């Protein structure tokens, strides 16, 4: 809603905005083949079958 | 939003990521908003409440008012019930045949027309009853109204002459106007003659308890009774406009007649569409119309009989020369005598309260023409008139009184005499002054120690006091300033007078100080003037501090009741004057100081020549010198004296600095000029503390020129390496006799030679004027001002 546009503090808020979002698309394909299982466990690696 | 982004300016006045900061200006946004819902809330409920009235009587007369409309629909269709039912009886033979007989008034109006002009012809006497008042007619209640409703039955003839107009017959207003010219005429001017005398006779200075009582109720009854009967017949012009121009004008005739309607719509038709309205029926029903002039149109010659008494006492002359409001706020005190008196006689009309205004309309008027120009008293002009507007409205409500509108321009001419005055009476004051100072054997009054005041100045302190009693009389801001501050344009020709003859008492003691000890062939005519200026000058300066005394302490000691915007008016030019109460000591004073020095020229230049180096030149300076600070100092004004003796030492260095430019060959050469630098310093010591006795100036206003004692030491004594920091210290401290003086001093001197002159006198020019550039960006000009003594090539 507020575009602000510009710095003060938004902009600068949204770089760690969009790159904790693609950080959270990073663990959030981690954890998706993490047991996809396209490495096997109950987890990941934890083996529990 | 073009707020919201000056405000992210302002929330970005607390950073870029401020969120503490932010949390506590989002307070401050909280602040701002809760200030302004305050004033918004309660604002808004006022407004609120305004709107709840507003509709709530929107409501209540609407509903309520279109039933009291609808309520006059109630009593008023009520109205219509009993229409040609009521009063139980043969009402119709009552309106018919009963008032058949009310259109027969022929026997009255032959009997009354007839006795109307016998009985007025008699009452063109007995009700005309005068000569002189014996209860002003005797008893104009009984006589002066007597011809009122005498004139209101022959308001049949007068005012119902002009509701009979053609009526039935031509003879009603014919064969009875010659029975209304000993009937009308003779009953309405007999209500007038003992009206005009009546008012005449409440005219007459008591007038009286039953004389006005009564002639004055008859003034009050036919006044306010021809007053609501002429008002009935202009509101039967306004109720015939009100009613026949909403007939003949409704508009629906519509060309809409010529030419007995515009004009006269609304009028509009006598007996009865005319007349009726005034008429019967119609209880009053004449309308009456006695009497027009009892007072109605009499009662403005009872206030303009005081105020043509009043206007009348003036007396234009005036006999003495402001002797109008005499007379006539005599007339304004009869006209308030006559005014409550005839309040207390006649409530209605006939001078209730009125007589007193209408005084103060002649004694304001006729004071505004008694000192028009400047043809009464000039000097005596604004206090009369001004002593009769406060004092002739403190003599009644504050308002029998003199309205002037005079009294300012009478001040711009009490400015032109005063100061003109003036003018005249300081010249004569100076010049008396002056030609009394040049006879220099006797003193001014007598004190033997010099503070002395004088004779046509305290013709000025006291006189010029009293001339400004007119001045804080009336406390004006265009005189008390005015007078003053241009007084004090007077006052600036008299110190330049001061230093104007005051430089002829310093020409006249120098040279009579020529004909004492300085080579005679000097002598001028006004001259002949032995020591003594000192008394002179010093009791100039003596009174410019007695000036600081009436003028000064005077004018903050008396003015005192206007702000002190006016008062500052007057503080801006007598009170700064204190400065100029040594100014004529800055022209007089140095005066003193060449006139210590005048029988004394001999050594004042065989200073820096051999015969000062080992001989008694300085003690003719020093002890001589020294004795003219040891009488003028018993005898001289303080502001005067600091000042003074601080340029006695300074001008007396400079005396002791004059021949420096001679080009004598200093003898530092076996020490007989550097011991009159020395051992005179000794003898050059107490010119500066013996001088100075009864304070502690004795080094305190000479150590400045003990500069200039020890540097100069340092400068003319010693040799090459010792001239350098000579113009280093003297140059931190006096580069006001500059460099060159230097050369002047190797100008007398062979052993520094002109090469050394260059080195040390140039690159120290380059001191004087780079350090001129450095630390005066030394102090001021002083004694040694303008001595840059003169220099050669370098």
Request: proline fraction near 2%.
């Given at each position: 809603?507020n575009?602000?546009?510009?710095?003060?503090?938004?902009?600068?808020?949204?770089?760690?905005?969009?790159?904790?979002?693609?950080?959270?698309?990073?663990?959030?394909?981690?954890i998706?083949?993490?047991?996809?299982?396209?490495?096997?466990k109950?987890?990941?690696?934890?083996?529990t079958? | 939003?073009?707020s919201?982004?000056l405000?992210?300016?302002?929330?970005?006045?607390?950073?870029?990521?401020s969120?503490?900061?932010?949390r506590?200006?989002?307070?401050?946004?909280?602040?701002?908003?809760?200030?302004?819902?305050?004033?918004?809330?309660?604002?808004?409920?006022?407004?609120?409440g305004?709107?709840?009235?507003?509709?709530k009587?929107l409501?209540?007369?609407?509903?309520?008012?279109?039933?009291?409309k609808?309520?006059?629909?109630?009593?008023?269709?009520?109205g219509?019930?009993?229409?040609?039912?009521?009063?139980?009886?043969?009402?119709?033979?009552?309106?018919?045949?009963?008032?058949?007989?009310?259109?027969?008034?022929?026997?009255?109006?032959?009997?009354?027309?007839?006795?109307?002009?016998?009985?007025?012809?008699?009452?063109?006497?007995?009700?005309?009853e005068?000569?002189?008042?014996?209860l002003?007619?005797g008893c104009?209640?009984?006589?002066?109204?007597h011809?009122?409703?005498?004139?209101?039955?022959?308001?049949?003839?007068?005012?119902?002459?002009?509701?009979?107009?053609?009526?039935?017959?031509?003879?009603?207003?014919?064969?009875?106007?010659?029975?209304?010219?000993?009937?009308?005429?003779?009953?309405?001017?007999?209500?007038?003659?003992?009206?005009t005398?009546?008012?005449?006779?409440m005219?007459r200075?008591?007038?009286?308890?039953?004389?006005?009582?009564?002639?004055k109720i008859?003034?009050?009854?036919?006044?306010?009774?021809?007053?609501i009967?002429?008002?009935?017949?202009?509101?039967?012009?306004?109720?015939?406009?009100?009613?026949?121009?909403?007939?003949?004008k409704?508009?629906?005739?519509?060309?809409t007649?010529?030419?007995?309607?515009?004009?006269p719509?609304?009028?509009?038709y006598p007996?009865?569409?005319?007349?009726?309205?005034?008429?019967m029926?119609?209880?009053?029903?004449?309308?009456?119309?006695?009497?027009?002039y009892?007072?109605?149109?009499?009662?403005?010659?009872?206030?303009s009989?005081?105020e043509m008494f009043?206007?009348?006492?003036?007396?234009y002359?005036?006999?003495?020369?402001f002797?109008?409001?005499?007379?006539?706020?005599?007339?304004?005190?009869?006209?308030?005598?006559v005014?409550?008196?005839?309040?207390?006689?006649?409530?209605?009309?006939?001078?209730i309260?009125?007589?007193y205004?209408?005084?103060?309309?002649?004694?304001?008027?006729?004071?505004?023409?008694?000192?028009?120009?400047?043809?009464?008293?000039?000097?005596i002009?604004?206090?009369?008139?001004?002593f009769?507007?406060?004092?002739?409205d403190?003599?009644?409500?504050?308002?029998?009184?003199i309205?002037?509108?005079?009294?300012?321009?009478?001040?711009?001419?009490?400015?032109?005499?005063?100061?003109?005055?003036?003018?005249?009476?300081?010249?004569?004051?100076?010049?008396?002054?002056?030609?009394?100072?040049?006879?220099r054997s006797t003193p001014?009054?007598s004190?033997?120690?010099?503070?002395?005041?004088l004779?046509?100045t305290?013709?000025?302190?006291?006189?010029?006091?009293?001339?400004?009693?007119v001045?804080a009389?009336?406390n004006?801001?265009?005189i008390?300033?005015g007078?003053?501050?241009?007084?004090?344009?007077?006052?600036?020709?008299?110190?330049?007078?001061?230093?104007?003859?005051?430089?002829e008492?310093?020409?006249?003691?120098?040279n009579?100080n020529?004909?004492?000890?300085?080579?005679?062939?000097?002598?001028?005519?006004e001259?002949?003037?032995p020591?003594?200026?000192?008394?002179?000058?010093?009791?100039?300066?003596?009174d410019?501090?007695?000036?600081?005394?009436?003028?000064?302490?005077i004018?903050?000691?008396?003015?005192?009741?206007?702000?002190?915007?006016?008062?500052?008016?007057?503080?801006?030019?007598?009170?700064?004057?204190?400065?100029?109460?040594?100014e004529?000591?800055?022209?007089?004073?140095?005066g003193?100081?060449t006139?210590?020095?005048?029988?004394?020229?001999?050594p004042?230049?065989?200073?820096?020549?051999?015969?000062?180096?080992?001989?008694?030149?300085?003690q003719?300076?020093?002890?001589?010198?020294?004795?003219?600070?040891?009488?003028?100092?018993?005898?001289?004004?303080?502001?005067?004296?600091?000042?003074?003796?601080?340029?006695?030492?300074?001008?007396?260095?400079?005396?002791?600095?004059?021949?420096?430019?001679?080009?004598?060959?200093?003898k530092?050469?076996?020490?007989?000029?550097?011991?009159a630098?020395?051992?005179?310093?000794?003898?050059?010591?107490?010119?500066?503390?013996k001088?100075?006795?009864?304070?502690?100036?004795?080094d305190?206003?000479?150590?400045?020129?003990?500069?200039?004692?020890?540097?100069?030491?340092?400068?003319?004594?010693?040799?090459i390496?010792?001239?350098?920091?000579?113009?280093?210290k003297?140059?931190?401290?006096?580069?006001?006799?500059?460099?060159?003086?230097?050369?002047?001093?190797?100008?007398?001197?062979?052993?520094?030679?002109s090469?050394?002159?260059?080195?040390?006198?140039?690159?120290?020019?380059?001191?004087?004027?780079?350090?001129?550039?450095?630390?005066?960006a030394?102090?001021?000009?002083?004694?040694?001002?303008?001595?840059?003594?003169?220099?050669?090539?370098?």
């Amino acid at each position: 809603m507020n575009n602000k546009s510009l710095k003060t503090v938004e902009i600068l808020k949204p770089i760690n905005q969009q790159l904790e979002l693609q950080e959270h698309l990073l663990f959030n394909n981690l954890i998706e083949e993490i047991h996809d299982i396209m490495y096997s466990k109950s987890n990941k690696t934890n083996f529990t079958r | 939003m073009s707020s919201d982004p000056l405000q992210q300016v302002c929330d970005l006045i607390k950073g870029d990521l401020s969120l503490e900061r932010v949390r506590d200006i989002k307070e401050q946004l909280l602040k701002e908003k809760s200030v302004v819902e305050y004033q918004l809330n309660k604002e808004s409920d006022k407004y609120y409440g305004e709107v709840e009235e507003s509709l709530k009587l929107l409501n209540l007369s609407k509903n309520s008012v279109t039933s009291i409309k609808q309520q006059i629909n109630e009593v008023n269709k009520l109205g219509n019930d009993n229409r040609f039912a009521i009063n139980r009886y043969d009402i119709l033979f009552r309106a018919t045949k009963l008032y058949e007989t009310v259109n027969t008034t022929s026997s009255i109006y032959d009997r009354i027309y007839n006795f109307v002009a016998l009985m007025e012809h008699i009452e063109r006497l007995l009700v005309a009853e005068l000569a002189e008042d014996a209860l002003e007619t005797g008893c104009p209640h009984l006589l002066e109204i007597h011809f009122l409703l005498t004139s209101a039955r022959d308001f049949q003839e007068q005012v119902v002459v002009m509701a009979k107009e053609a009526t039935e017959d031509a003879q009603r207003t014919v064969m009875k106007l010659f029975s209304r010219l000993s009937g009308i005429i003779s009953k309405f001017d007999k209500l007038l003659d003992g009206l005009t005398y009546d008012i005449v006779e409440m005219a007459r200075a008591e007038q009286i308890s039953l004389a006005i009582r009564l002639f004055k109720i008859y003034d009050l009854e036919e006044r306010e009774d021809l007053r609501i009967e002429a008002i009935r017949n202009i509101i039967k012009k306004k109720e015939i406009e009100i009613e026949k121009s909403s007939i003949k004008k409704l508009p629906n005739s519509k060309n809409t007649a010529r030419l007995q309607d515009e004009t006269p719509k609304v009028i509009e038709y006598p007996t009865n569409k005319g007349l009726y309205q005034e008429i019967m029926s119609g209880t009053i029903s004449t309308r009456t119309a006695p009497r027009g002039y009892k007072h109605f149109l009499i009662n403005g010659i009872n206030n303009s009989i005081s105020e043509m008494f009043g206007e009348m006492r003036e007396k234009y002359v005036g006999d003495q020369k402001f002797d109008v409001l005499d007379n006539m706020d005599w007339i304004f005190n009869e006209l308030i005598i006559v005014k409550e008196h005839i309040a207390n006689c006649c409530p209605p009309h006939w001078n209730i309260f009125e007589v007193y205004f209408d005084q103060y309309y002649k004694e304001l008027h006729s004071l505004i023409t008694d000192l028009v120009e400047s043809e009464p008293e000039t000097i005596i002009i604004l206090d009369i008139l001004a002593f009769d507007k406060t004092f002739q409205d403190t003599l009644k409500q504050d308002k029998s009184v003199i309205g002037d509108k005079e009294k300012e321009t009478l001040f711009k001419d009490y400015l032109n005499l005063i100061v003109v005055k003036m003018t005249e009476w300081i010249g004569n004051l100076e010049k008396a002054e002056f030609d009394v100072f040049l006879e220099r054997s006797t003193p001014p009054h007598s004190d033997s120690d010099g503070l002395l005041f004088l004779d046509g100045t305290k013709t000025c302190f006291q006189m010029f006091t009293q001339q400004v009693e007119v001045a804080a009389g009336t406390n004006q801001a265009k005189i008390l300033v005015g007078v003053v501050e241009r007084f004090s344009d007077l006052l600036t020709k008299r110190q330049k007078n001061w230093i104007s003859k005051i430089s002829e008492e310093i020409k006249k003691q120098i040279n009579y100080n020529h004909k004492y000890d300085i080579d005679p062939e000097s002598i001028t005519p006004e001259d002949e003037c032995p020591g003594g200026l000192v008394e002179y000058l010093i009791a100039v300066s003596n009174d410019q501090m007695k000036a600081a005394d009436y003028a000064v302490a005077i004018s903050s000691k008396y003015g005192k009741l206007v702000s002190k915007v006016y008062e500052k008016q007057i503080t801006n030019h007598l009170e700064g004057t204190l400065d100029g109460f040594a100014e004529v000591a800055q022209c007089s004073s140095l005066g003193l100081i060449t006139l210590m020095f005048d029988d004394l020229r001999k050594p004042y230049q065989e200073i820096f020549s051999k015969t000062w180096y080992m001989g008694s030149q300085a003690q003719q300076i020093a002890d001589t010198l020294d004795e003219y600070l040891l009488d003028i100092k018993p005898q001289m004004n303080s502001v005067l004296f600091v000042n003074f003796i601080d340029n006695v030492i300074g001008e007396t260095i400079i005396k002791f600095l004059t021949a420096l430019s001679f080009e004598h060959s200093f003898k530092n050469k076996n020490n007989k000029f550097l011991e009159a630098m020395k051992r005179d310093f000794e003898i050059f010591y107490q010119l500066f503390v013996k001088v100075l006795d009864g304070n502690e100036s004795k080094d305190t206003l000479i150590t400045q020129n003990f500069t200039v004692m020890e540097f100069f030491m340092d400068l003319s004594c010693e040799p090459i390496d010792s001239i350098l920091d000579i113009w280093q210290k003297y140059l931190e401290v006096y580069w006001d006799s500059r460099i060159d003086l230097l050369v002047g001093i190797l100008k007398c001197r062979k052993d520094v030679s002109s090469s050394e002159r260059k080195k040390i006198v140039q690159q120290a020019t380059e001191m004087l004027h780079e350090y001129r550039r450095n630390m005066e960006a030394d102090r001021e000009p002083t004694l040694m001002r303008r001595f840059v003594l003169e220099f050669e090539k370098q």
